[PDB]
Design a protein around this ligand. Structure first.
Ligand SMILES: Nc1cccc2c1C(=O)N([C@H]1CCC(=O)NC1=O)C2=O
Ligand SMILES: [Zn+2]
Lengths: 381, 817
């Protein structure tokens, strides 16, 4: 099922605004060194690079910093806070501004800005400024890319038999199990010179790991092959890491890794060894059905969404969610999705403010089969 | 703070390129063999090959083609190094001190750009108008060649296609022409460009792009008067000339594809083709057509000649003698007699040059009466694997062929027999069985056995069947051949005694592999016990994972199942028992131990250290080191320093600083020494080739670690005293201003730490070859070598330092190998 809804509008966040002032992206950094960057407070979320984030700011100090940044380099630091609060952070990710809008209307501060992370860095000490926008020293962490594992011992003879033909058709049986055997037998042909077999080198390759991740993802949900999954291992790893339902400590551990292959192996291990989900205070929940989780968006099952009253909020698009209670009529005055009506779905035991059931609005839609969860009270077990 | 000393004992013998041309003189015919860091110039005669020179460059040879610019009497030589140290060498006989002067030198690498995935390609215009290269994707580098060009300035030219398979210049054209095949989603095509030097840009090719077979790999340029290029694929050998087009699909070359070639005639009427399986094809061109003075092809028949060593680079010498240069086997010199035909084979062996590599695993054994030591290696691969014995008393090397690839080795003494694993190729016949291909050493043993345990396709596909051989140390004949179950893969092998038991047990760790699943799920540890010429399975334990490497602890057995390091205790009931576990974040591949220190590595450089506290009985984690690189082999030099190899043929030494006053610094491993060895290291093992006499005061060297390499050279890395390192560093930094290397490549470059992302100067390592080369330098230059060395540190200085004292110093370091 595809429930006949375009999944590119929830990524653009139409509800936030319409007449956006687009900012063209050109920005990089020192490339393995250090810099200094303003930090926006009142935000607590680890931002994997490539993940979109919308922001809503009300106090004068941060909006003044926003205008100053707009008339400057477009970058601000979001420190990945640990479990302990009160500036107990060591790693942060920079954020880039690609769209801005005032929409002052009544007017207190009122800013309509969406941001995406670009790079990773570490903080030595958190310098404090009395203005309100603390600035920190920052060592731009490296992005280490590794060459092919077979390039060290490669023969000068069979150098030419290393560019394989493209995949046969796409996403078909007997065109992958048959083709991957030939791929492994031909690409890693010089594995006999070293003291290790071919499959061991296959465990530390880039293409095979990405194919396995893609197969697992399509086993989860109906993904249209190359539905905005970049062929580059870096961006693919970042996107898949962003779209997984994992705790914050494991996410910061993934952020710690600086190499694509190690990150992919660790992520594969994590989502292979993670099956169950919990309701924080509650002992257990029906959300354990990790297999039955589709993605009603182009960014994945998870994305960053904002509320009209403050802090950014997290979501999880699950097909069915039991152990929940529904309160309030279905309303869509401020909906995270254009053609959906949101209903505040509370819990059944702990009664936490987690869950949002979406009902039918049109004919070719999903009638009363949609939910949005919260990682604040959701933890893998 | 490492003070290590790396020296080369047996010079590398692998071959990665051979060309012929009138190099030494216009009348002689030379066979320049490019091995690796060394270059050898031979002279062909009626009897065979007569060596002339052994010249060693400061780099790895990657491109070597001979060209003859106008106005030259003898052919020059063009050599490109992996580190892009381009140079043009010219041979010159000066009396009897034959030296190779350097015509030009200069780096050609670009500041930014990923190296091509296919690899470096070197091509030269037949008219010697320019020199071509392909170093980075989409950048076909061109180096103009002129008498005034003594710096090798290169200008990039943009290639319209990124994935380029093979590019080689064409013959018989007024303007320079290239003919290359590229990869596109719509398929593979052959397209040509007319490179112009004046415009420094491409042009329109003589003949348009033509579709080719989906497995086009290698391109041969046919010389005059035919013209055009021959595109050889997995199934067909084609020919393109624009209007003309010939293609044939013989079934003989169907089994394996062709990877190497070399012309045999000035007009290219016949050709040579080699493949991985190891058979020498013989392509023929029919030139009987002659319409109006032009010559065109009529037939592309392919005729097989016979089976030789596994080809890496061929060459056709005079009088029908073909140098079948191998890389993973043994080099040969076959004769193409078309009149013998003993049974249908056109090739007969004449000579055999020893080729140690590719070494896979090693052991040091005193096979004589407790005298010297003897590096019993596991050379070869595919059908040419063999056991080599390397003594020190020039190194003498005797071969024991097995016709089967060996993986590891170990030497039990209380049964005076060797234990070597093996892996031979078995073809899947359409009957459910496993029929062999050739008589291998596993099927010709005195006895045999087949493992039978109950604890748990297509006709044409190949399946690997593993064996564990037992070889006597005297006759070197196979005595028994134990064979594991179907789809079982042998990884580890250790010969050690366990617990209080008096016997010596062969232990083999195996991990089942299935095509369906990616990583192994269940493995097996089997404990054999050789006695009275009969292998018996005393014990058998199953593990949910893969057994990657194993060692012994003074009566205990240690194994690394998947990502967990496990300790096994040998009980009195002869059944392995688990004692303690340590779940690691990495997958433990290498286990090297010394005392209570455990050096747990992986394939991604993540060196991790462990210490086994006996009072508590569980592992404790001491040191950490994380850095993304491909670590090849790791060895523990001493109680503190750990040695290993990593990407770009480098050597690194890590040191743990127990003197640090903070816990944050103690839990981290410094990088003290980095070195660019120039070889890929496969295995490390303790021991030395020289008699281990006490020697009263011994020598400045202390300790001994040997390493084997893919190219097959034996090195001896040791430790040094504090002042000796500074003295040797000063001597080495003064030697660079006396000796003149070939190509002018600077020593610090050929030894600088190299990586695709970062390069730093080498420290903590003394090059043993540069120091050992001092004894060959002429006496008058020795005065310039040393003038203020401050020779003694202990008890005097002798500022003058004379000249004879340094000779004694170098000889003491040379005596170790
Ligand atoms: N905590 C509050 C408080 C008031 C209103 C809303 C929320 C909230 O989370 N959303 C979501 C509901 C889900 C949706 O579709 N759009 C929203 O803004 C609201 O409208
Ligand atoms: Zn609850």
């Amino acid at each position: 099922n595809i429930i006949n809804f375009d999944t590119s509008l929830p990524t653009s966040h139409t509800y936030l605004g319409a007449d956006m002032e687009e900012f063209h992206g050109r920005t990089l950094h020192d490339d393995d060194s250090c810099q200094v960057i303003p930090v926006l407070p009142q935000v607590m979320m680890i931002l994997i690079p490539g993940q979109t984030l919308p922001l809503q700011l009300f106090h004068p100090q941060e909006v003044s910093m926003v205008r100053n940044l707009i008339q400057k380099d477009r970058t601000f630091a979001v420190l990945a806070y640990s479990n302990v609060q009160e500036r107990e952070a060591q790693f942060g990710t920079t954020a880039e501004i690609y769209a801005y809008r005032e929409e002052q209307d009544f007017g207190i501060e009122i800013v309509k800005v969406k941001a995406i992370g670009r790079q990773r860095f570490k903080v030595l000490e958190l310098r404090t400024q009395s203005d309100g926008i603390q600035q920190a020293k920052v060592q731009i962490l490296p992005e280490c890319v590794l060459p092919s594992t077979m390039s060290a011992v490669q023969l000068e003879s069979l150098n030419k038999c290393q560019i394989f033909p493209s995949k046969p058709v796409s996403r078909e049986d007997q065109c992958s199990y048959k083709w991957w055997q030939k791929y492994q037998k031909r690409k890693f042909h010089c594995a006999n010179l070293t003291s290790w077999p071919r499959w061991l080198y296959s465990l530390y390759d880039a293409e095979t790991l990405m194919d396995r991740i893609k197969k697992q993802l399509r086993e989860w949900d109906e993904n249209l092959k190359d539905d905005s999954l970049p062929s580059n291992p870096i961006d693919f790893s970042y996107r898949v890491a962003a779209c997984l339902p994992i705790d914050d400590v494991l996410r910061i551990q993934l952020l710690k890794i600086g190499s694509a292959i190690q990150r992919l192996r660790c992520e594969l291990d994590i989502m292979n060894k993670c099956t169950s989900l919990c309701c924080k205070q509650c002992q257990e929940t029906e959300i354990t059905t990790k297999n039955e989780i589709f993605s009603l968006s182009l960014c994945g099952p998870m994305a960053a969404y904002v509320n009209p009253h403050g802090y950014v909020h997290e979501t999880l698009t699950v097909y069915k969610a039991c152990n929940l209670n529904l309160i309030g009529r279905p309303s869509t005055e401020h909906s995270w999705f254009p053609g959906y009506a949101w209903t505040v779905a509370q819990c059944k035991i702990c009664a936490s403010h987690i869950g949002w059931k979406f009902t039918a609005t049109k004919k070719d839609m999903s009638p009363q089969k949609f939910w949005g969860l919260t990682r604040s009270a959701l933890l893998p077990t | 703070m490492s003070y290590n000393y790396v020296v080369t004992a047996q010079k590398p013998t692998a071959v990665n390129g051979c060309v012929t041309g009138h190099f030494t003189s216009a009348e002689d015919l030379n066979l320049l063999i490019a091995k690796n860091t060394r270059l050898e110039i031979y002279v062909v005669t009626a009897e065979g090959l007569r060596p002339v020179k052994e010249v060693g460059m400061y780099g790895k040879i990657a491109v070597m083609e001979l060209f003859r610019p106008k106005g030259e009497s003898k052919d020059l030589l063009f050599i490109l190094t992996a580190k892009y140290n381009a140079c043009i060498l010219e041979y010159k006989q000066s009396g009897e001190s034959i030296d190779i002067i350097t015509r030009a030198h200069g780096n050609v690498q670009d500041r930014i750009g990923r190296p091509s995935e296919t690899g470096i390609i070197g091509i030269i215009d037949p008219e010697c108008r320019m020199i071509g290269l392909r170093l980075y994707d989409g950048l076909f580098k061109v180096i103009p060649l002129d008498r005034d060009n003594k710096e090798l300035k290169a200008f990039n030219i943009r290639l319209e296609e990124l994935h380029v398979i093979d590019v080689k210049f064409l013959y018989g054209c007024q303007a320079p022409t290239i003919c290359f095949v590229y990869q596109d989603p719509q398929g593979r095509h052959v397209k040509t460009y007319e490179v112009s030097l004046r415009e420094k840009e491409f042009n329109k090719g003589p003949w348009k792009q033509e579709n080719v077979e989906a497995e086009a790999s290698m391109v041969i340029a046919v010389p005059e008067p035919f013209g055009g290029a021959i595109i050889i694929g997995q199934e067909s050998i084609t020919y393109h000339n624009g209007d003309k087009y010939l293609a044939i699909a013989p079934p003989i070359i169907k089994q394996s594809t062709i990877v190497c070639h070399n012309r045999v005639d000035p007009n290219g009427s016949r050709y040579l083709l080699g493949d991985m399986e190891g058979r020498l094809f013989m392509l023929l061109l029919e030139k009987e057509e002659q319409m109006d003075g032009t010559v065109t092809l009529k037939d592309l028949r392919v005729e097989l000649l016979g089976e030789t060593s596994i080809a890496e680079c061929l060459t056709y010498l005079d009088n029908g003698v073909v140098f079948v240069g191998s890389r993973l086997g043994d080099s040969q010199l076959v004769k193409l007699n078309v009149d013998s035909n003993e049974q249908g084979s056109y090739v007969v062996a004449m000579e055999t040059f020893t080729n140690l590599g590719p070494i896979v695993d090693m052991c040091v054994v005193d096979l004589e009466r407790q005298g010297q030591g003897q590096l019993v290696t596991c050379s070869g691969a595919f059908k040419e694997g063999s056991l080599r014995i390397i003594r020190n008393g020039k190194l003498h090397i005797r071969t024991v062929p097995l016709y089967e690839s060996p993986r590891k080795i170990c030497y039990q003494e209380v049964s005076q027999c060797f234990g070597v694993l093996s892996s031979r190729i078995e073809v899947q016949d359409t009957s459910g069985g496993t029929t062999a291909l050739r008589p291998s050493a596993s099927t010709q043993a005195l006895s045999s056995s087949v493992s039978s345990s109950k604890l748990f396709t297509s006709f044409g596909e190949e399946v690997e069947v593993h064996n564990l051989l037992i070889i006597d140390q005297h006759t070197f004949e196979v005595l028994h051949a134990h064979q594991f179950l179907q789809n079982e893969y042998a990884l580890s092998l250790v010969s050690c005694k366990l617990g209080k038991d008096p016997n010596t047990y062969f232990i083999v760790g195996t991990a089942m592999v299935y095509p369906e699943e990616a990583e192994p799920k269940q493995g097996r540890i089997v404990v054999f016990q050789y006695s009275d010429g009969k292998l018996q399975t005393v014990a058998e334990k199953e593990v949910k994972g893969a057994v990657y490497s194993m060692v012994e602890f003074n009566g205990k057995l240690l194994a690394s199942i998947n990502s967990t390091v496990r300790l096994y205790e040998w009980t009195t009931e002869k059944e392995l028992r688990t004692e303690c576990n340590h779940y690691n974040n990495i997958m433990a591949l290498y286990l090297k131990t010394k005392g209570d220190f455990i050096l747990v590595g992986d394939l991604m450089r993540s060196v991790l250290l462990l210490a086994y506290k006996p009072m508590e009985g569980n592992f404790e984690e001491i040191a950490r080191d994380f850095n993304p690189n491909w670590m090849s082999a790791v060895e523990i030099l001493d109680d503190d320093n750990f040695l290993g190899a990593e990407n770009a043929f480098n050597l690194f030494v890590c040191q743990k600083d127990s003197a640090a006053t903070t816990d944050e610094e103690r839990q981290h491993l410094q990088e003290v020494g980095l070195f660019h060895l120039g070889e890929f290291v496969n295995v490390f093992c303790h021991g030395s080739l020289v008699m281990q006499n006490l020697g009263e005061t011994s020598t400045p060297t202390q300790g001994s670690v040997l390493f084997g390499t893919v190219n097959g050279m034996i090195g001896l890395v040791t430790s040094l005293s504090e002042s000796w390192y500074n003295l040797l560093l000063d001597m080495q930094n003064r030697l660079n201003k006396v000796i003149k290397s070939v190509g002018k490549i600077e020593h610090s470059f050929w030894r600088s730490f190299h990586t695709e992302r970062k390069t730093e100067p080498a420290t903590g390592f003394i090059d043993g070859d540069l120091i050992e080369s001092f004894l060959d330098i002429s006496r008058p230059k020795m005065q310039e070598v040393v003038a203020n060395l401050q020779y003694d540190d202990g008890s005097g200085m002798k500022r003058e330092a004379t000249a004879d004292d340094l000779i004694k110093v170098v000889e003491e370091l040379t005596r170790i190998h």
